[PDB]
Design a protein around this nucleic acid. Structure first.
Lengths: 127, 100, 98, 150, 113
RNA sequence: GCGAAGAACCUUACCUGGUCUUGACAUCCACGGAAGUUUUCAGAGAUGAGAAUGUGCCUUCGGGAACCGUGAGACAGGUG
RNA sequence: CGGUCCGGCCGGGAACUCAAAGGAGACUGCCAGUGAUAAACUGGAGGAAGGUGGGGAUGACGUCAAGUCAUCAUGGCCCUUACGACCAGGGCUACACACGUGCUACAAUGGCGCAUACAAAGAGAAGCGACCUCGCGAGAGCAAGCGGACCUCAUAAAGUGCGUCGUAGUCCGGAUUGGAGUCUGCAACUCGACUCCAUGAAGUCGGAAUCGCUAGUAAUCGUGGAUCAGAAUGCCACGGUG
RNA sequence: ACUAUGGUUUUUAUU
C-alpha cells in the first residue's frame, strides 16, 4: 500500500509517495539532509502532517522539478495533502477546512495585446 | 511612390560592375590609418564616391508594393495594410488568425 | 541509407505526403521507424487592423511549419522515385539525398 | 457598487506563537521585500525590551492601548450636512491603524536605523509627544465639539 | 591633518577629505594615497610627521585649481587676431550643443524674458 | 511620443540659382552605338567636351536582347 | 520491464515532469430560506473551482456638415515654359514664453564591494558571434562553432549570504564649462554615436485641477526584437518578490 | 424632501 499525490506552482512540478511505516523523508533519489535544513519556517513541508498529527507514523518519498527553490517546496505542499487525504476518511474534511485541499490560479496569465503586464491600460490627464 | 521613381529604383542598382566590383580590394583599405605617408593613391581615392544617388549609400530594400523605404514587413516585402488586405481573402498560405 | 525531408504548412497535407512513403511501405511488409511527427516550428506576426489613421488597434496571426523525416531502410521505385513526382497534393516541399 | 468580497485573515505563526507577532512581515515591509522584513522579526521586540523590559504580557499594554482607534468621523449628506458624524469603531480595528496611518516624517527625513525602528515606534507609542499626536487626539475633541447630529 | 592644501579640519575619510576640492580629481584620488601608505579601508594611526607632503608631486603631475581654471578659460583663446566661431555664443543664451533651441535652454538663458 | 520606426543628401513637401517643354514614367513606329576600359578640361552639378579603346550575347545574315543615345504623333504628367 | 563502460549508456516504455494537445466538470441541477412556494439572491452539500468563476474573443442603429482624396478608390476642378520632370546648395532641427506626451533624481529597509540561485522570450550563412592579441577604452586586426528544442548572443536582477559608508543638499543629484580619443560618411562648422579623466548648478513630493486602482493588483527589480553609419522614454514580447 | 444663491456664447451656405 502507497498513497500518491502531485503539485504545481510557478513553473515548479512535484510528485509524492507516502507509506505506513517508520518516520523518514527522502527527495530526488538523494538524502533530504544534503540540501534542506536552512528554510526559515518550513511550513510547506510540515503543516499538513501537523494537522493529522502523524509525527513518525508515515514514510515519505518525494520527486520535484522546475522553477525556483521556494516554489519547489510550495508545490510539495499540495503533494503532501493529495497523498494524505487517503490516510483516513474522517480527515478529508479537516485538510479542506485547513485550506490545504483548495488551489488558486493567481499566478500570471497569457499576455493580452498590447498591455505590458496584461492588467493595466495607458494613462492620461486634462479634459 | 511614382512610376518615374520606380525607374530610378532600377537606375540605382545599374552601377554594380561599373563602379562597385573592380575596386572592392581598394574599398577594404582606402580609409585604414595603419599605413605609410599622408597621401598615396589620390588618383583613385574618389572613384567610389564620384557616383551619386546610385550608390550603396542610398540602396534600400524598399516596400515591393509602394516604393516606400520605411514602415514595411521585411518577411513579406510589403506594408501592414497589404497584409491586412490579403488576410481578409485568406490569400497568404499557412497564415491564420491566432494570438497564442 | 537513402534520406528524405517532407515539409508543409498544413497538418493533414504533411500526413498525406507521409502516407505515400509509409503506408506504401507497411503494405509491402517493409521495415519502418514508426509514427514520429517531430517537434513543430511556428512564428507569430502582429498586424494593424485598420487600413487608415488608427495606429493602436492591432490583431495577431500565426504560421506553423511541419517537418517529417519518416526514415527509410527498404527504399523502392514506388517510394523514393514516386514522392518527387507527386502532383495530386499541392503546397508541400519534398527534398531527398543519397 | 455590489462587491461583497470575503475578509482577509492571518494565522498565528508557530515561530512567534501569536497573531499580534505574525504581521511584522507586512507592517514596516517595503518594495515587496518580505524576507528583508523577516530578517528583523521578534528580535526587534527583544530590542524593545532593551528600552523597557517588562515581558510579553506587558509588551503592548500601553504601546497599543495609548494609540488604538476609538472613533470613525467625516460627514454624511442628508441636507444641510456641514457637520461631522462620529461612530465608535468595531473590535476588528482594536490592533489596527496605529502602525499604518502616518508616514509624514518617515518618507520626508527618514525614521532612524531600520533594525532599531520598531523598538523606536513601540517606545514612541508609549511616549506620546510631538509626531502622530494631533492625528490621534483631534478626534477626542472633534467628537465632543461637533456631535449634535448622530 | 594637512591632506589637502591648507584646509584645517582633521575630519572625514582620506578620499572624501581630498576629492571635489582644488580640481585634483574625484577618481584620480583613488590611486594616490599609497604614496603616504594611507589605505582606502580601516582607520589611520601609523602616519609619521610630515609624511603627508608626499602627495604634492603626485597631484602636480597634472594641473591643479588655477592651472585647470586657466586650461578651461584657454579653450577659445588660441586664435584672437582674427574672427573665430568661438566668442559670440560665449556671450549668448544660445549654447554650442546642436540642440532644438526653443526648449530646455533656461539653464543657459537665465532669469527674465 | 501627430499623419511619419531614425536627418549631410534620402523618404520631402518648402526656397533660391541652374536645365527641359508632347517633355518622360511608358506603348506602337523610327534609329546609331555593345555594356564597357584608360583619361583631361569647364560648371555648384545636372550637363558639355578632349584624347585613347572593346566589339561580347544574338546573328534565317534579314533582324533582335542587355546597357545607352535621339526623333514624330496619339498625348499625357502631378511628390495637386 | 530487461540488458549492463553499472551511466537513458542501450533494448524499449511514458510513471510524472517539458512540449504537443484533447477531454471531464457547473445544470439553481440538489437541499433549505425569502418571494408572486416565478425569476432572482444567500447559506448547506459534492467540488480544485458556483450562481457572466476570473481573464480572452469581440463592437447592432446612429449623430459631430469630426478628421481623411498621405491607405486606397473616384467625379469634378486646378497647374501645364509649370504647381510636371531633372539638378546643386539652402530649409524643414530657425527662437525673447505657453502647454501636453513622457524620463531621471528629489537618497540612508538609500549606495556599493565580494560571493550565490530560478524565470520566460526573441535574433541567426555581405548573417548570430565565442576565442586571442594590441590599447586606459570606444575600436583595429586575427577568428572557432551555428544551420536550429541539436550551436554562438548568455553565469536573469531584486530576494539569499558576508561586509562597508559617516549624518553631510550627502561618496547624493544630474544641466554644463574643459582636456584627450574611436569610427562612419561626398561632409559631421551648421547638424553625430561611443570611450577615458579634470568641473558641477537646480532638486527635499509639488497650487487650482485632472488622474490609474477592489489584489499577484499598489510597491520594487529583471529579458529581447522590429528600424539599422548615427538615431525613442513609444511599440510588441516576457518573469521574480508583494 | 435633504443646504438659500450664480450670468453671457454675432446674423451666417444649411441639410
Amino acid at each position: 500500500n502507497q498513497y500518491y499525490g502531485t503539485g504545481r506552482r510557478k513553473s515548479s512540478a512535484a510528485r509524492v509517495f507516502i507509506k505506513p511505516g517508520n518516520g523518514k523523508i527522502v527527495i530526488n533519489q538523494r538524502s533530504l539532509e544534503q540540501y534542506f535544513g536552512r528554510e526559515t519556517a518550513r511550513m510547506v513541508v510540515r503543516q499538513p502532517l501537523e494537522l493529522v498529527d502523524m509525527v513518525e507514523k508515515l514514510d515519505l518519498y518525494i520527486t520535484v522539478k522546475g522553477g525556483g527553490i521556494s516554489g519547489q517546496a510550495g508545490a510539495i505542499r499540495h503533494g503532501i495533502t493529495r497523498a494524505l487525504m487517503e490516510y483516513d476518511e474522517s480527515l478529508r474534511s479537516e485538510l479542506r477546512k485547513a485550506g490545504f485541499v483548495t488551489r488558486d490560479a493567481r499566478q500570471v496569465e497569457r499576455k493580452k495585446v498590447g498591455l505590458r503586464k496584461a492588467r493595466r491600460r495607458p494613462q492620461f490627464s486634462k479634459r | 511612390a511614382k512610376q518615374s521613381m520606380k525607374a530610378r529604383e532600377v537606375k540605382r542598382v545599374a552601377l554594380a560592375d561599373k563602379y562597385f566590383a573592380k575596386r572592392a580590394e581598394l574599398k577594404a583599405i582606402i580609409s585604414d590609418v595603419n599605413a605609410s605617408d599622408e597621401d598615396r593613391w589620390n588618383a583613385v581615392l574618389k572613384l567610389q564616391t564620384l557616383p551619386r544617388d546610385s550608390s550603396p549609400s542610398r540602396q534600400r530594400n524598399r516596400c515591393r508594393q509602394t516604393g516606400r523605404p520605411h514602415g514595411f514587413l521585411r518577411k513579406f516585402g510589403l506594408s501592414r495594410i497589404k497584409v491586412r488586405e490579403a488576410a481578409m481573402r485568406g490569400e497568404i498560405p499557412g497564415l491564420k488568425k491566432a494570438s497564442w | 541509407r537513402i534520406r528524405i525531408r517532407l515539409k508543409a504548412f498544413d497538418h493533414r497535407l504533411i500526413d498525406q505526403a507521409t502516407a505515400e512513403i509509409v503506408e506504401t511501405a507497411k503494405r509491402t511488409g517493409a521495415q519502418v521507424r514508426g509514427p514520429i511527427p517531430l517537434p513543430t516550428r511556428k512564428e507569430r506576426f502582429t498586424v494593424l487592423i485598420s487600413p487608415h489613421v488608427n495606429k493602436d488597434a492591432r490583431d495577431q496571426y500565426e504560421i506553423r511549419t511541419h517537418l517529417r523525416l519518416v526514415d527509410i531502410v527498404e527504399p523502392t521505385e514506388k517510394t523514393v522515385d514516386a514522392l518527387m513526382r507527386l502532383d495530386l497534393a499541392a503546397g508541400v516541399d519534398v527534398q531527398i539525398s543519397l | 457598487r455590489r462587491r461583497v468580497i470575503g475578509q482577509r485573515k492571518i494565522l498565528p505563526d508557530p515561530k512567534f506563537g501569536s497573531e499580534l507577532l505574525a504581521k511584522f512581515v507586512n507592517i514596516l515591509m517595503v518594495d515587496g521585500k518580505k524576507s528583508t522584513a523577516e530578517s528583523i522579526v521578534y528580535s526587534a521586540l527583544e530590542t524593545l525590551a532593551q528600552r523597557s523590559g517588562k515581558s510579553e504580557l506587558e509588551a503592548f499594554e500601553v504601546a497599543l492601548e495609548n494609540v488604538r482607534p476609538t472613533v470613525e468621523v467625516k460627514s454624511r449628506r442628508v441636507g444641510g450636512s456641514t457637520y461631522q458624524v462620529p461612530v465608535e469603531v468595531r473590535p476588528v480595528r482594536r490592533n489596527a491603524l496605529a502602525m499604518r496611518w502616518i508616514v509624514e516624517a518617515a518618507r520626508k527625513r527618514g525614521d532612524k536605523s531600520m533594525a532599531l525602528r520598531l523598538a523606536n515606534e513601540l517606545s514612541d507609542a508609549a511616549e506620546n509627544k510631538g509626531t502622530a499626536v494631533k492625528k490621534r487626539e483631534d478626534v477626542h475633541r472633534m467628537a465632543e465639539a461637533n456631535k449634535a447630529f448622530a | 591633518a594637512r591632506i589637502a592644501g591648507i584646509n584645517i579640519p582633521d575630519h572625514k575619510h582620506a578620499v572624501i577629505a581630498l576629492t571635489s576640492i582644488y580640481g585634483v580629481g574625484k577618481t584620480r584620488s583613488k590611486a594616490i594615497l599609497a604614496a603616504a601608505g594611507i589605505a582606502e579601508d580601516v582607520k589611520i594611526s601609523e602616519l609619521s610627521e610630515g609624511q603627508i607632503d608626499t602627495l604634492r608631486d603626485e597631484v602636480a603631475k597634472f594641473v591643479v585649481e588655477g592651472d585647470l581654471r586657466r586650461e578651461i578659460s584657454m579653450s577659445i583663446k588660441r586664435l584672437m587676431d582674427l574672427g573665430c566661431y568661438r566668442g559670440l555664443r560665449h556671450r549668448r543664451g544660445l549654447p554650442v550643443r546642436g540642440q532644438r533651441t526653443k526648449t530646455n535652454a533656461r539653464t543657459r538663458k537665465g532669469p527674465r524674458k
